[PDB]
Amino acid sequence: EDPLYCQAIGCPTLYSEANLAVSKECRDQGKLGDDFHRCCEEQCGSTTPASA
Questions:
Q1: Distance separating alpha carbons of residues 50 and 2, to the nearest angstrom
Q2: How far is CA 3 from CA 23, 25, 35, 49, 50, in A?
Q3: CA distance 17 to 21
Q4: Domain 16-43 bears CATH identifier 6.10.140.540
Q5: Is there a contact between 39 and 10 (Cβ–Cβ < 8 Å)?
Q6: Which cysteines are disulphide-bonded (predicted)?
């Protein structure tokens, strides 16, 4: 009916090709609750290379 995908501040916009890959990972985890924010900010888009 209505596909639930991410639309966060930095991360790719809702109807972009890169969004389907990152938003589908967060949609599969859980269902409807907390996940989406911490999974769309943790898996956002362009990650910076840094070994902590």
A1: 37
A2: 10, 13, 16, 31, 33
A3: 8
A4: yes
A5: no
A6: 6-40, 11-44, 26-39
